[PDB]
Amino acid sequence: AMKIALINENSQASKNHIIYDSLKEATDKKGYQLFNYGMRGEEGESQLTYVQNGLMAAILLNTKAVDFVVTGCGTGVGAMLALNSFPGVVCGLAVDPTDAYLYSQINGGNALSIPYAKGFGWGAELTLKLMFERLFAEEMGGGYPRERVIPEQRNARILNEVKQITHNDLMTILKIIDQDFLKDTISGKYFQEYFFENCQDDEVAAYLKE
Amino acid sequence: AMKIALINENSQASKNHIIYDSLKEATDKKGYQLFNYGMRGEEGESQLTYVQNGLMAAILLNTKAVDFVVTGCGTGVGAMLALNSFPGVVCGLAVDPTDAYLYSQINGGNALSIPYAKGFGWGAELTLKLMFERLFAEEMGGGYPRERVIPEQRNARILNEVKQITHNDLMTILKIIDQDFLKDTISGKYFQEYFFENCQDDEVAAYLKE
Please name each of the domains of chain B with its CATH number: 1-210 (3.40.1400.10)
CA atoms within 13 A on the CB side of B188: 25
Ramachandran area for residue A21 (φ above 0: left; ψ -120 to 50: alpha; else beta)? alpha
Contact predicate A67/A4, CB 8 Å = yes
| Residue A69: strand pairing partners | A5, A111
This structure's resolution (angstroms)? 2.0
Q: In A, which residues are within 8 Å of B91 by CB distance?
A: 81
Burial of A184 (0-12, 13-18, 19+ CB in 10 A): middle
Q: Do B9 and B204 touch, CB atoms closer than 8 A?
A: no
Other Cβ atoms less than 10 A from the Cβ of B21: the count is 12
Sorted by sequence, the CB contacts under 8 Å of residue A107 that are 6+ apart come out as A90, A92, A141, A156, B77, B78, B81
Cα distance from N-terminal residue to C-terminal residue, chain B: 30
Our CA-based measurement puts residue A126 at a distance from the nearest CA of chain B, in whole angstroms, of 21
State the pairing for strand pair A68-73/B3-6: unpaired
- Nearest by CB to residue B166, choosing from A103, A159, A167, is A167
Is there a contact between A38 and A113 (Cβ–Cβ < 8 Å)? no
Alpha-carbon span B15 to A208, nearest angstrom: 49
Q: For chain A, how far is it from start to end, CA to CA, in angstroms? A: 30
What CA–CA distance (Å, rounded) separates B191 from B173? Answer: 19
A68-73 β-sheet, strand order: A33-36, A3-6, A68-73, A111-115, A91-93
Q: How far apart are CA B167 and CA B157, in angstroms?
A: 16
Contact B81 A92 (CB under 8 A): yes
Q: Which of B10, B4, B181 is nearest to B79 (CA)?
A: B10
Residues A87 and A58 sit within 8 Å (Cβ to Cβ): yes
Task: Round to whole Å and give the CA distance between B48 and B43.
Answer: 13
Instruction: Centre a 10 Å sphere on the Cβ of residue B111 and count the other Cβ atoms it contains.
Output: 28
- B96 to chain A, minimum CA–CA distance in Å? 11
Cβ B162–A85 below 8 Å, yes or no? yes
Q: Which residues of B touch A177 (CB under 8 A)?
A: 162, 165
How many other C-beta atoms are found inside a 10 Å radius of the C-beta of residue A1?
9
Distance of alpha carbon A109 from alpha carbon A90, whole angstroms? 5
Where does B4-62 have alpha helices with state H?
16-30, 50-62
**Is A98 in CB contact (< 8 Å) with chain B?**
yes
For residue B106, list chain A residues with Cβ-Cβ distance below 8 A: 74-75, 77-78
Residues of A with CB below 8 A from B161's CB? 178
Is the CB of B92 less than 8 angstroms away from the CB of A82? Answer: no
Q: What contacts A123, CB < 8 A, 6 or more positions away?
A: none
Query: Is residue A122 within 8 Å of residue A80, measured between CB atoms?
Result: no
Phi then psi dihedrals of residue A150, to 5 deg: -60, -60
CB atoms closer than 10 angstroms to residue A7: 28
User: What's the length of chain A?
Assistant: 210
Residues 6 or more apart whose CB falls under 8 angstroms from that of B136 comprise B26, B27, B29, B30, B32, B104
Say if residues A156 and A103 touch (Cβ distance below 8 Å): no
| Record: contact B93-A93, CB cut-off 8 A | yes
A87 cis-preceded (ω within 30 degrees of 0): no
